[PDB]
Amino acid sequence: RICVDHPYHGMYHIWTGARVAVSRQRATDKIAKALSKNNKVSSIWPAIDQTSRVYHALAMDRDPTRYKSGQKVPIKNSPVGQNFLSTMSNNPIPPPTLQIEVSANLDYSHVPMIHKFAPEMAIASGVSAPKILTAIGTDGRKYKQLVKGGNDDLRQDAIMEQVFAAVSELLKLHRETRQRNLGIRTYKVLPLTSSSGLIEFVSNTIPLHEYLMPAHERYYPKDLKGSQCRKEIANAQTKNTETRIAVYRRVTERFHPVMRYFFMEYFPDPDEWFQKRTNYTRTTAAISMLGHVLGLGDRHGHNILLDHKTGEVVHIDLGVAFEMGRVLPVPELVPFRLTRDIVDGMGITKTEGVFRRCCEFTLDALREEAASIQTILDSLRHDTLYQWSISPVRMAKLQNSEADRAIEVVKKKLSKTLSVMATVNDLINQATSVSNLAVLYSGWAAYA
């Protein structure tokens, strides 16, 4: 009944389930067969069927010659590309990465369908080339998409995105966090199979590392390069903590932060500049507290996007949660990312100010909703497919009862024993400490 009333919310789950695992597959197949038989959803299920088939085919198709990392290839030269374009022309659906709100009136006609595709598609660097499609919709907007193929697990990322969205929705019920619009920015992950998915390409952002590495040499031409700092920190990775900390101090004495310019060069108007810098500080505070409480890890520069229209950061790739990050070979022993550049984007008042007061309001509203957070994680506990440990596949892809332990740690981070002021002071002390930042992995660019 859910898939019949709200098809764009249940039919992709049914498709993924069809196309104790054998019994689940059989039951989902029976539901799919029944879906392609009734009158309400009969021009919608075949569309999603054929479209998902061609999206998956396009995802799995990797050719090192036909797809060169960094190029921009017109999607008409591979047979997969032409079959994809034709099938998408014959079957109109809403863009699979568009976030559709649930309709109480059960009317999904106001949803933009895919009108056409832009002729070309970009390519990113990797082995299984992730391709960035663009789709021009009926209402004339551009929906970009990452068609991600390979051996990744996007169901982790999708589940955690849903959990983070639910907790941020809890934040709206309290006066202090609602007055400041404290919350997180969401994106849409859609796993097609156990090896492919569609990720929403966030509209007008730029990765934090891709701004910071050119800016560091544009504003300080006498400093070290980003690559020289990374290599110098990675060479002293098998040495005693004293030498690692000495090398880290030596590197960061020749590397100065430049983040404060991101706002002086995208927003030259002082009114707009002030508002956007405040948006950045508030969204950083909210996601720092929310990712401490849920153990969120893997917070390097390529998982943080800077929205250069509203100023506010977006965190993607949220799958390494519940402290799975301090189990890695070179553990991530910081509660959140607060390096010198994240803190430089905040101005004269480095921390004391908007960032600390917003950390305290967030953490104070979170430990007054510990029952609802317990309910959300409990619903997570009855999910047979969610893995509570990081499988050595991804653990090798990252650095070159488990439910009960995780939920207990989350439950003791929300304990009212210490005051909020003292808790936040301790967190900001251990997130900015040089002895903690010096022993982090070199791909986690802490010098930056």
Binding site: M421, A422, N425, D426, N429
Partner: protein
């Protein structure tokens, strides 16, 4: 408000109650302003006592005090007033003795419930302390009076709160008036001595009020102490560190942790804790900062030990006995 707005007649009673409330907090200026406004002063005997407690606290020594009144506030007020308007100790002693005599006659009168009884006994205690400091002749008796105040503090820490607050407020008035009135004092008692004794009595009262968890009285005391520093630097006294530490304690007890920590660190940075009266050891200050920084998580537990605890153990200078080293 709701009775002033509706032109109700109960507002008078309300005003009366408010006065009472505001005189149990320590806000004397607000109750004074509430007093003058009222023009029908017909509030059985609650208004009679409230009209002279406030006058004594704000030091308004020109009220015409009624004669033959059963109120302790009037008795104590007449004693202090006569201490203000007099050039010889004999007049003041005569007024104090008249006060003691009248209070005893009133206690003998009979039908008094327990609160009025304990108020009268506290009036006797206040007059006796007044008579004690009026009769000091040299420094040794001054120090003996101070030691007496300390032993009485030992009893006060656990006693009833009304009695303690009454005795301690009257003692504050006594010490301040004695410090102001230079012609009542003996020969060899300079003004620096009277000032120093006033300050020590105030710090003692601040300890006593801190255990009772009376926030407003520690606030009043620390403010009135901070106001004495300009007039203390001109008499040749160095009492800035102890008074600023009392202010830091008031802050910490109202919840301002970071302000208290910053204030103590400023005391430790720019202040000469050696050459100054009302002594203050550097190791107890350092350990106080260390305790407060640990409670507020303001620094990492590896810097707390390096900046505050090991410097404290080094400031002891090999002394391994006493309460300072125990702390």
């Amino acid at each position: 408000d709701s009775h002033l707005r509706g032109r109700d007649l109960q507002s008078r009673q309300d005003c009366n109650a408010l006065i009472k409330a505001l005189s149990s907090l320590g806000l004397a200026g607000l109750s004074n302003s509430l007093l003058q406004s009222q023009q029908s002063i017909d509030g059985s005997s609650d208004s009679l006592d409230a009209t002279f407690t406030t006058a004594r606290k704000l030091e308004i020594w020109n009220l015409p005090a009624p004669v033959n009144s059963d109120s302790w506030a009037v008795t104590v007020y007449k004693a202090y007033q006569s201490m203000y308007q007099a050039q010889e100790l004999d007049t003041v002693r005569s007024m104090v003795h008249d006060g003691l005599k009248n209070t005893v006659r009133h206690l003998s009168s009979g039908s008094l419930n327990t609160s009025v009884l304990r108020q009268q006994l506290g009036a006797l205690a206040a007059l006796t302390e007044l008579d004690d400091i009026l009769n000091v002749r040299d420094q040794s008796e001054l120090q003996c009076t101070l030691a007496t105040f300390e032993k009485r503090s030992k009893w006060m820490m656990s006693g009833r709160y009304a009695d303690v607050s009454q005795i301690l407020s009257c003692r504050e008035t006594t010490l301040s008036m004695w410090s102001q009135r230079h012609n009542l004092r003996a020969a060899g008692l300079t003004s620096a001595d009277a000032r120093l004794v006033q300050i020590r009595g105030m710090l003692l009262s601040s300890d006593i009020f801190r255990f009772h968890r009376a926030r407003q009285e520690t606030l009043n005391l620390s403010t009135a102490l901070s106001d004495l520093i300009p007039s203390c630097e001109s008499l040749g006294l160095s009492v800035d560190a102890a008074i600023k530490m009392e202010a830091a304690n008031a802050l910490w007890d109202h919840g301002e942790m970071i302000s208290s920590i910053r204030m103590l660190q400023a005391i430790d940075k720019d202040s000469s804790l050696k050459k100054q009266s009302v002594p203050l050891s550097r190791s107890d200050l350092l350990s106080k900062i260390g305790y407060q920084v640990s409670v507020a998580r303001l620094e990492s537990p590896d810097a707390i030990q390096k900046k505050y605890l090991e410097p404290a153990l080094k400031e002891l200078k090999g002394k391994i006995e006493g309460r300072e080293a125990g702390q």
